[PDB]
Amino acid sequence: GAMAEYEIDEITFHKRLGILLTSWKNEEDGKTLFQDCDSILVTVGAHDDTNPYQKSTALHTWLLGYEFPSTLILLEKHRITILTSVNKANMLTKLAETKGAAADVNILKRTKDAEENKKLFEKIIEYIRATNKKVGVFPKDKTQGKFINEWDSIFEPVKSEFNLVDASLGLAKCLAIKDEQELANIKGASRVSVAVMSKYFVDELSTYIDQGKKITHSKFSDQMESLIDNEAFFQTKSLKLGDIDLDQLEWCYTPIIQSGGSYDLKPSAITDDRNLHGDVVLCSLGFRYKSYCSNVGRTYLFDPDSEQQKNYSFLVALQKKLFEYCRDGAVIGDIYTKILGLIRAKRPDLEPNFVRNLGAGIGIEFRESSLLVNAKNPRVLQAGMTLNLSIGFGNLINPHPKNSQSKEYALLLIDTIQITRSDPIVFTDSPKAQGDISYFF
């Protein structure tokens, strides 16, 4: 359709490229994170709306501001080669002539000339051959289409000449520490998420329950999702989102709504087609702003019994401790174990119900898996990291279920936080006390 407004900042491009190369040149990192590669080969095929979070895409977004479909990048220690359509290369040519360049910028331009196009691919092979033949890749990434099939026809027959190694962790290290702009983006996204949860979802939810509305979870979810199409909604002075560029706003995923005895605390949960029940309701939702993700999740209780309120209040208290533990220098695995330790000390009865991880890092990727908050993770938190923290209890048993009543429930809290040297900043903070989220008919 229409011509978009692409802001590709030269300075940011070279700053970030320099960060990557600096890590790569580090004796230690170069060996362990980059696995001794002399080049890094990244491809992107056909754009896929339903697959936004791959490392290859993230690299584009981080360096350029946007995914470039049907493009190949070959990183070398002081060069970046970008092989893309001549029509896309128009947006890139300014990078080649930037003052404080972090590397040579080598733009190879595809045209209608099929033979010349083939030669461009052949140049990439030539470059790799002139190296130690160790090539860093993102092995998980899924791609398809005409561009990729062309490349495959050229690369696959010669691939055995090369040692392909996983350079994922090398990029992960660089993405992990958010700069001022990136933190601003995540904070913006977070603000939208909390506004929608607090100022739309809760109002709708409590009304539906009070009025005995018949509505499926997926129908409620779709309703809430459609809100992104309503610019007037975001512009309501109450929401205090006046500064947000709505054109750069997207959903991270389809909001997850659960009730009526069927729960799933995994981020992979899909809203079902069951009728909304006024018992224990979980909702998770998150916006993406300028390609940076956020996430928020809450529990709502309707005519809860004393045990449900007690357990929920315990969750809130544990989450407070989790925040306190999440600071610069903290070993990730230690954080999980400390939280487990609080459970075992104070509510050992709840151990079997406890989540196995407490979330992960968040940014351009919805999930930065290297920062997964479980017991095993040896990595250390650093100021500037951002975490999508999730804590909960599942398969909690109701002592006196009514004929018409759920046998089990779950409890959940999710917030997006920025790591500092002290207490973290909770971007998605909103009142979460039992009294604030409990409703009595």
Topology:
Layout (H helix, E strand, L loop, with lengths): L9 H16 L1 H6 L6 E6 L10 H9 L7 E6 L2 E7 H4 L14 E7 L3 H16 L4 E4 L8 H10 L7 E4 L1 H9 L3 H32 L5 H9 L5 H4 L14 E3 L4 E3 L21 E6 L1 E3 L2 E2 L2 E7 L3 H20 L6 H15 L12 E3 L24 E12 L10 E11 L6 E2 L7 H4 E2 L2
Parallel strand pairs: 1-5, 3-4, 5-6, 12-17
Antiparallel strand pairs: 1-2, 2-3, 7-10, 8-9, 9-12, 10-11, 13-14, 14-15, 15-16
Helix pairs in contact: 1-7, 5-6, 11-12
What does this structure look like?
Helix 5 packs across helix 6 and helix 11 (306-325) packs antiparallel against helix 12. The chain folds into 2 domains: 1-175, Creatinase/prolidase N-terminal domain (Creatine Amidinohydrolase, Chain A, domain 1, 3-Layer(aba) Sandwich), CATH 3.40.350; 176-441, Creatinase/methionine aminopeptidase superfamily (Creatine Amidinohydrolase, Alpha-Beta Complex). It has 441 residues and is α+β, with helices and mostly antiparallel strands. The strands form 4 sheets. Strands 4-3-2-1-5-6 form a 6-stranded mixed β-sheet. A 4-stranded mixed β-sheet has the order 8-9-12-17, with helices on both faces. The protein has a 4-stranded antiparallel β-sheet with strand order 13-14-15-16. The chain has helices at 10-25, 27-32, 55-63, 86-89, 114-129, 146-155, 168-176, 180-211, 217-225, 231-234, 306-325, 332-346, 434-437; strands spanning 39-44, 71-76, 79-85, 104-110, 134-137, 163-166, 249-251, 256-258, 280-285, 287-289, 292-293, 296-302, 359-361, 386-397, 408-418, 425-426, 438-439. The protein is globular. Helix 6 (146-155) links the parallel strand 5 (134-137) and strand 6 (163-166). It is classed as transcription.
